[PDB]
């Protein structure tokens, strides 16, 4: 018993990089605006895609840390997609449902510009607030799969590997939050709780078999998330850590634009005929190095 303490100083620059698993689930909604009734819902799962996060952290002052983090899809990954439509106004049970297990998660990425304000600090604890800006992007392509239309009056399979629906989402937002830190010998744990009432969501939908594109753009959606990690200082300058991330983007609502691909001609439809939501977690492991010159 006689351990190894982190070697931190003011004006430090820190760099950390981790890698692991990205998972989550998005929704693509179509409503009747007048009645708020759901005429469609697309469910784009995400199944362990391999990611790579990276952290960069100048703490100019001891009570102040600037931060630029982000992660990216390492390559096309494993997804899924299900497509429901409630076509009979007089029926709770949806009438249409296609399924596309062969859904590719083309790519995924996020960046996060964050500042941390420490209001209280001693040698093992820290508490403060954070403010920042995030943007997050997802891309899928559902291919093949099967379908039932008209409550199964036309069951069947799609052509293996043919582009069916393409879909991408973007969630941009300013955020604020509470931050805590706990050290002790060669251990450091970081918890963070984040929130926003000012999410801006966009999505794009190509139905290639209908030759139609769709534009959904949302403002004022709500969001909440957490970042927690635990690490050990293997040296005074190096911390091996594991890290969990969660992000919930609440359904924002707005209008839909429809472009007819083979005419160009476009048509816009009215408020809350569309929804855009998502749900994240990342499990990630790596190493942090602190320089501080």
Curated annotation (Swiss-Prot):
Its EC number is 3.4.23.48. In the mammalian host activates (cleaves) plasminogen to generate the serine protease plasmin. Plasmin degrades fibrin clots (fibrinolysis) and facilitates bacterial cell migration, enabling rapid dissemination of bacteria from the initial site of infection. Cleaves host plasminogen to generate plasmin and probably also has autocatalytic activity. Fibrinolytic activity prevails at 37 degrees Celsius whereas coagulase expression predominates at lower temperatures (28 degrees Celsius). Cleaves plasminogen; plasminogen cleavage is much higher than coagulase activity. It comes from the Bacteria. Residues 20-49, 74-110, 134-173, 196-223, 247-280 are extracellular. This is Plasminogen activator. It comes from Yersinia pestis. It catalyses: Converts human Glu-plasminogen to plasmin by cleaving the 560-Arg-|-Val-561 peptide bond that is also hydrolyzed by the mammalian u-plasminogen activator and t-plasminogen activator. Also cleaves arginyl bonds in other proteins. It is an enzyme of class 3 (hydrolase). The chain crosses the membrane at residues 11-19, 50-59, 64-73, 111-119, 125-133, 174-183, 187-195, 224-234, 238-246, 281-291. Requires bacterial lipopolysaccharide (LPS) for activation; addition of LPS to inactive protein reactivates it. In the absence of LPS the active site groove is slightly narrower, and peptide substrate binds deep within the active site groove, displacing the nucleophilic water molecule. Changing residue 83 to A: No plasminogen cleavage. Residues 1-10, 60-63, 120-124, 184-186, 235-237 are periplasmic. Forms a narrow, elliptical 10-stranded beta barrel with the active site pairs on the extracellular surface. It is found in: Cell outer membrane. The active site is at 83, 85, 205, 207.
